[PDB]
Amino acid sequence: IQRTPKIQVYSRHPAENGKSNFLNCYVSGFHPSDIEVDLLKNGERIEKVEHSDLSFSKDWSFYLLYYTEFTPTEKDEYACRVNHVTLSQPKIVKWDRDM
């Protein structure tokens, strides 16, 4: 068995279009210590994505962080993709502030 990792995608601080911001993608609820998640743009992979030092959870799911520095716009769009054996298809969640 196993547990399905769930997707959260949101801006670490207030999102401003035409402004530099910090993305945050939190994929947790899963096993083992490893999950692979990538950040997208309308459908395509982001390369400047960086993952910080893994994590340490005393009891709950081990957390893994994937973020990128970006300049949001009205016209463009960024997404989160996660791959795990539980998800019959890798999960994509588009980033938004009001949606």
Computed structural class: mainly beta
Largest sheet: number of strands, sense, barrel closure? 4 strands, antiparallel
- The CATH superfamily bears the name Immunoglobulins
| Rg result | 14 Å
User: What proportion of the residues form beta strands (DSSP E)?
Assistant: 35-45%
The sequence of SSEs as H and E is EEEEEEEE
Ends distance: 33 Å
* Outline type: globular
As a percent range, the share of helical residues equals: under 10%
CATH-defined fold name: Immunoglobulin-like
**What is the CATH domain class?**
Mainly Beta
The number of helical elements comes to 0
Question: Total number of β-strand segments?
Answer: 8
The number of domains: 1
- What would you say the CATH architecture is? Sandwich
Domain Ig-like C1-type: 5-93
Organism: Homo sapiens
Glycosylation sites: 1, 19, 41, 48, 58, 91, 94
GO molecular function: identical protein binding; MHC class II protein complex binding; peptide antigen binding; protein homodimerization activity; structural molecule activity
